[PDB]
């Protein structure tokens, strides 16, 4: 009835932070950040909004300012990251997903991305966008997206300094190990964009690490 409208804010050179909302069973509504990275005249969707409406608005807002949407990539199989894939597929816009996240969607009777990748890393665009997989954590497929020439890290729902959040499809045992490996590879971070918290810096990495180890202990 009353849910904030899609917000698109500029983050750096060609990087935009997009936020959509959705009523789940928390203290009500919960915001979710994603990103549009502009390479040249080509935009890329790092995670999509929860719905087609928000995904349709986001796309056109960029197409309006003369940018062709080259594709999207989802961080994990959940909805704050895969909802708008459907809309995108019908408009036949290249959609990407990890082979584990596309398997998980399938499992849930959800439409699948039209492009898969595997391995510890994938260059969506060779020297500008890397997708890294530190290992099971928030969910078992969650990936992280790295912006080389800007030191920005999109860590979606994996990065959660203040609270682990939805433990639904977690791997509490391994989150600490992945959280540790992630702090190592990309500690060279300028910015770190969580899915449900204010933008940060290398510190959100150490925070989620303690947050995760505590979660592991706090269960045994
Ligand atoms: Zn999630
Ligand atoms: Zn989430």
- CA angle 63–4–10, rounded 5-degree value: 45
CA–CA gap between residue 211 and residue 155 (Å, rounded):
15
Beta-strand ranges (E) seen in the chain are 7-12, 15-23, 29-38, 42-46, 68-73, 95-98, 115-117, 121-125, 129-132, 144-147, 152-156, 191-194
Q: How far is the centre of ligand 1, averaged over its atoms, from the C-alpha of 30 (Å)?
A: 12
Give the residue among 79, 125, 80, 124 at the shortest CA–CA distance from 98: 124
Active-site pick, 80, 141, 142, 183: 80
* 18 is annotated as an active-site residue: no
CA–CA gap between residue 120 and residue 5 (Å, rounded):
35
Q: Where are the domains of the chain?
A: 1-220
Token duo for residue 24: 């789940």
Give the residue among 42, 90, 49 at the shortest CA–CA distance from 66: 42
* 166 is annotated as an active-site residue: yes
Give the residue among 128, 155, 164, 112 at the shortest CA–CA distance from 15: 128
For residue 139, which ligand has an atom nearest its CA?
1
* 157 is annotated as an active-site residue: yes
Q: How far is the centre of ligand 2, averaged over its atoms, from the C-alpha of 66 (Å)?
A: 31
Q: DSSP secondary-structure letter at 113?
A: P
Question: In DSSP terms, which residues pair with 129 in a beta bridge?
Answer: 125
Q: Which residues contact 97 (CB under 8 A, 6 or more apart)?
A: 73, 74, 77, 82, 85, 105, 112, 113, 115, 116
> Could you identify the residue written with the tokens 């082979």?
99
* 196 is annotated as an active-site residue: yes
Q: Which residues contact 212 (CB under 8 A, 6 or more apart)?
A: 137, 164, 175, 176, 179
Active-site pick, 32, 47, 54, 166: 166
Question: In DSSP terms, which residues pair with 98 in a beta bridge?
Answer: 117
Q: How far is the centre of ligand 2, averaged over its atoms, from the C-alpha of 139 (Å)?
A: 10
Give the residue among 171, 155, 160 at the shortest CA–CA distance from 81: 155
* 188 is annotated as an active-site residue: no
Q: Which residues contact 219 (CB under 8 A, 6 or more apart)?
A: 172
Experimentally determined by = X-ray
Q: How far is the centre of ligand 2, averaged over its atoms, from the C-alpha of 115 (Å)?
A: 22
- C-alpha separations of 124 from 53, 67, 106, 108, 186 in Å: 25, 18, 22, 25, 17
Best CATH choice for the domain 1-220 from the list 3.40.109.10, 3.60.15.10, 3.40.50.1240, 3.40.50.720: 3.60.15.10
Q: How far is the centre of ligand 1, averaged over its atoms, from the C-alpha of 135 (Å)?
A: 15
């Amino acid at each position: 009835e009353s849910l904030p409208d899609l917000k698109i804010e500029k983050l750096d050179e060609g990087v935009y932070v997009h936020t959509s909302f959705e009523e789940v069973n928390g203290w009500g509504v919960v915001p979710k950040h994603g990103l549009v990275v502009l390479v040249n005249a080509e935009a890329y969707l790092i995670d999509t909004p929860f719905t087609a409406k928000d995904t349709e608005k986001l796309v056109t807002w960029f197409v309006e300012r003369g940018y062709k949407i080259k594709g999207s990539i989802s961080s994990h199989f959940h909805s704050d990251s895969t909802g708008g894939i459907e809309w995108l597929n019908s408009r036949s816009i290249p959609t990407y997903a990890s082979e584990l996240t596309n398997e998980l969607l399938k499992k849930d009777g959800k439409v699948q991305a039209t492009n898969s990748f595997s391995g510890v890393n994938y260059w969506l665009v060779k020297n500008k966008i890397e997708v890294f997989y530190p290992g099971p954590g928030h969910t078992p497929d969650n990936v992280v997206v790295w912006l080389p020439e800007r030191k920005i890290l999109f860590g979606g729902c994996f990065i959660k300094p203040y609270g682990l959040g939805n433990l639904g499809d977690a791997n509490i045992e391994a989150w600490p190990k992945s959280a540790k490996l992630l702090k190592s590879k990309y500690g060279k971070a300028k910015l770190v964009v969580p899915s449900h918290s204010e933008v940060g810096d290398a510190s959100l990495l150490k925070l989620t690490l303690e947050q995760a180890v505590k979660g592991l202990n706090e269960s045994k």
